[PDB]
Write a protein that binds this ligand. Sequence first.
Ligand SMILES: *[C@@H]1O[C@H](CO)[C@@H](O[C@@H]2O[C@H](CO)[C@@H](O[C@H]3O[C@H](CO)[C@@H](O)[C@H](O)[C@@H]3O)[C@H](O)[C@H]2NC(C)=O)[C@H](O)[C@H]1NC(C)=O
Ligand SMILES: *[C@@H]1O[C@H](CO)[C@@H](O[C@@H]2O[C@H](CO)[C@@H](O[C@H]3O[C@H](CO)[C@@H](O)[C@H](O)[C@@H]3O)[C@H](O)[C@H]2NC(C)=O)[C@H](O)[C@H]1NC(C)=O
Ligand SMILES: *[C@@H]1O[C@H](CO)[C@@H](O[C@@H]2O[C@H](CO)[C@@H](O)[C@H](O)[C@H]2NC(C)=O)[C@H](O)[C@H]1NC(C)=O
Ligand SMILES: *[C@@H]1O[C@H](CO)[C@@H](O[C@@H]2O[C@H](CO)[C@@H](O)[C@H](O)[C@H]2NC(C)=O)[C@H](O)[C@H]1NC(C)=O
Ligand SMILES: *[C@@H]1O[C@H](CO)[C@@H](O[C@@H]2O[C@H](CO)[C@@H](O)[C@H](O)[C@H]2NC(C)=O)[C@H](O)[C@H]1NC(C)=O
Ligand SMILES: *[C@@H]1O[C@H](CO)[C@@H](O)[C@H](O)[C@H]1NC(C)=O
Ligand SMILES: *[C@@H]1O[C@H](CO)[C@@H](O)[C@H](O)[C@H]1NC(C)=O
Ligand SMILES: *[C@@H]1O[C@H](CO)[C@@H](O)[C@H](O)[C@H]1NC(C)=O
Ligand SMILES: *[C@@H]1O[C@H](CO)[C@@H](O)[C@H](O)[C@H]1NC(C)=O
Lengths: 36, 141, 49, 261, 96, 49
Amino acid sequence: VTLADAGFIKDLICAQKFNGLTVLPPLLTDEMIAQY
Amino acid sequence: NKCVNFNFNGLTGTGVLTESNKKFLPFQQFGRDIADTTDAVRDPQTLEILDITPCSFGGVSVITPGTNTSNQVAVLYQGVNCTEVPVAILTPTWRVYSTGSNVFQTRAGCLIGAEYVNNSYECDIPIGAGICASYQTQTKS
Amino acid sequence: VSMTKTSVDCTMYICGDSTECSNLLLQYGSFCTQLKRALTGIAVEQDKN
Amino acid sequence: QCVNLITRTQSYTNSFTRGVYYPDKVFRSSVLHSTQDLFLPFFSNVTWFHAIHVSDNPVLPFNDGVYFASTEKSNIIRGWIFGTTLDSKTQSLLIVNNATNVVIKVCEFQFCNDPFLDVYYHKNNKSWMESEFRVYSSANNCTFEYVSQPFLMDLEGKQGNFKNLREFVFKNIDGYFKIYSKHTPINLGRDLPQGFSALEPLVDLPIGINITRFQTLLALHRSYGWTAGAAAYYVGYLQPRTFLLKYNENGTITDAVDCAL
Amino acid sequence: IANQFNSAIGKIQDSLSSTASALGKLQDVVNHNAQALNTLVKQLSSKFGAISSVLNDILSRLDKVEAEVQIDRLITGRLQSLQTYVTQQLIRAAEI
Amino acid sequence: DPLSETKCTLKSFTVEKGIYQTSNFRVQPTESIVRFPNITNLCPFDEVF
Ligand SMILES: *[C@@H]1O[C@H](CO)[C@@H](O[C@@H]2O[C@H](CO)[C@@H](O[C@H]3O[C@H](CO)[C@@H](O)[C@H](O)[C@@H]3O)[C@H](O)[C@H]2NC(C)=O)[C@H](O)[C@H]1NC(C)=O
Ligand SMILES: *[C@@H]1O[C@H](CO)[C@@H](O[C@@H]2O[C@H](CO)[C@@H](O[C@H]3O[C@H](CO)[C@@H](O)[C@H](O)[C@@H]3O)[C@H](O)[C@H]2NC(C)=O)[C@H](O)[C@H]1NC(C)=O
Ligand SMILES: *[C@@H]1O[C@H](CO)[C@@H](O[C@@H]2O[C@H](CO)[C@@H](O)[C@H](O)[C@H]2NC(C)=O)[C@H](O)[C@H]1NC(C)=O
Ligand SMILES: *[C@@H]1O[C@H](CO)[C@@H](O[C@@H]2O[C@H](CO)[C@@H](O)[C@H](O)[C@H]2NC(C)=O)[C@H](O)[C@H]1NC(C)=O
Ligand SMILES: *[C@@H]1O[C@H](CO)[C@@H](O[C@@H]2O[C@H](CO)[C@@H](O)[C@H](O)[C@H]2NC(C)=O)[C@H](O)[C@H]1NC(C)=O
Ligand SMILES: *[C@@H]1O[C@H](CO)[C@@H](O)[C@H](O)[C@H]1NC(C)=O
Ligand SMILES: *[C@@H]1O[C@H](CO)[C@@H](O)[C@H](O)[C@H]1NC(C)=O
Ligand SMILES: *[C@@H]1O[C@H](CO)[C@@H](O)[C@H](O)[C@H]1NC(C)=O
Ligand SMILES: *[C@@H]1O[C@H](CO)[C@@H](O)[C@H](O)[C@H]1NC(C)=O
């Protein structure tokens, strides 16, 4: 499964941001989900 | 390499201008991204191609507990490089948090006014990307 | 189990670097707070799920 | 000078993928872009004219743009008339080109009936040039004159039977007249070859007048006396049409879908 | 029983590796999040009955009275594109 | 100050424990620049002046 945007610190990903649309990171990282 | 207002041949906008690895055709003047938004413009006088990206921006989340409990707060500049909020010495008129020694790059954004501690706890206030914040006294040493 | 958290803002989406439109948009009242709140209500729920 | 001696015969052939052109002056990379504009459809039935001289030449319609193609050596094809009346009752646009410079000139021209051009050897100037313009009586008032490099060139050297096909799209809109073109080499395979190539905008001219009809100029050398010759060209007409256009990493239109084929 | 289990776990890897569509229900969510933001950012280029979708084009070419109503159309249209996106998101959040 | 801004965006003198999105930050231009081609085609008004 490919992820379009991770939402991490800064393509269509850029242009979305250019117009104020932002992607927020999940609280639990993929390491914390692997630990659970 | 400086955030500026621009007008090329009547193509008006705002952003940082940077040299481009894109190679336009001789008759083309500007490039549109997948979102059909302008992201390059060819200088009319000397025909080099410049990338445009908007000047930096982001959300500003304030981490405040019960007003009754305390009046001090941290601020998270969302998706922002924590070297760039200092260069952004703007919409938030409160300049003071440009000069903070207690400054931290979370993956979620630049967090200012809260200090990183190596010890871990249950998540009191969520910041994002594994990070949480809390109002308490540490006293380890 | 979850979907991408998103946030947006009328100030930039409807008109970036545009004070004139920013003043016209005030005439429409609370809709932008409703939209921002609704997307924040989705975003906090993705962590909960 | 009103010599009605040129004539032309006609037939039909298939314009497979030809007559696609860059719709705006914009770069795009690896992106599929859709637009509604005057385009020539895929596998459109395209008229095939042969023009000849014997020692009968009807003026052509123009509406919603024309595609014109040809592939003659020595650049015997030399220009066009575009215009409302072509008789000095309303102004009209003349294109003529030679080996070193094209003129774009729009005036109240009385063209007589059939306009051709007459480059011949003059003994006293020891060289080739146009004798007298049989194209028209006289120009009365002119309001725009432009000069530039010949919109058409031959390939370097000359390979045997190796024609280049020359393509033009002519549009009139909002006062402007827009030329698009491409010059593609031909393995000497077939007419309008299989493959793809999009026309670049050559000139984009604020003529400002009204176009309803068009015609083309052929040269004659006057060797002693109008030595007889032949030429070919193809005419297609544009429609208000939707296209999906594919840009490569370099922002050339590499392929297209005709949206109602 | 252990060999049946161990050989069954061996087939999960090959199934997931070979099958293009196996994570379809997760890819679909990622694609709908990407398509919804692409559609929302594309909707900025729509005219909504105005002379142009470019705001400073309007402000340059038209006077304060006329320019304002042209922007209004763009405000009303864009604000519709946001309410649509947020309603689609609130419905899509409920099935997640 | 940023607490005074959260009190304002929540329309209340007492904000509770949490994280609150306030006004978006955005760096304004340092100046404005005009780019148009070389000044070709000067009008032949001089030949008559
Ligand atoms: C191809 O056709 C061209 C136009 O028919 C022709 O250009 C013409 O060139 C002559 C001489 O170079 C010009 O004559 C005038 O030149 C200057 C221009 O200011 C004057 O000072 C001179 O006194 C003289 O009047 C023509 O004006 C010019 N035509 C146009 C429309 O600009 C080319 O020479 C032709 N080329 C060949 C190979 O035949
Ligand atoms: C986009 O433009 C690119 C730059 O012009 C172009 O790259 C070029 O590709 C051709 C064809 O592969 C190369 O031609 C050959 O050159 C020598 C042999 O003469 C070989 O060593 C090369 O590998 C190659 O086969 C050009 O050298 C190459 N130019 C550059 C500067 O890299 C792309 O092909 C263009 N892309 C499309 C889709 O048209
Ligand atoms: C934030 O920006 C700084 C620069 O202000 C980045 O630091 C650069 O990192 C790259 C990659 O390691 C180096 O090649 C550069 O030399 C660094 N520049 C400077 C001036 O130190 C940093 O990587 C960025 N990081 C984040 C989290 O956004
Ligand atoms: C173009 O030139 C012709 C010829 O000089 C002009 O025609 C004259 O126009 C005037 C004004 O309408 C009439 O009174 C004359 O009877 C016309 N004479 C002829 C012979 O046509 C014409 O007006 C000029 N056009 C422009 C735009 O200057
Ligand atoms: C170009 O010329 C044609 C022909 O004169 C114009 O068509 C006329 O348009 C008027 C106004 O609609 C009608 O009353 C006439 O009956 C039309 N004439 C013919 C013969 O169809 C056309 O309007 C002109 N175009 C422009 C842009 O001026
Ligand atoms: C414009 O002038 C500059 C400076 O002389 C020159 O470098 C440039 O090539 C000119 N423009 C074009 C299109 O040649
Ligand atoms: C705030 O703190 C006061 C004591 O300083 C307490 O009486 C009050 O109940 C608190 N309010 C809330 C909402 O917790
Ligand atoms: C955490 O421990 C490292 C040493 O392992 C130390 O260098 C670092 O300063 C500590 N963290 C903070 C934020 O002080
Ligand atoms: C093209 O049109 C002409 C006249 O409309 C017709 O005679 C001819 O058959 C058509 N072409 C083909 C391949 O049918």
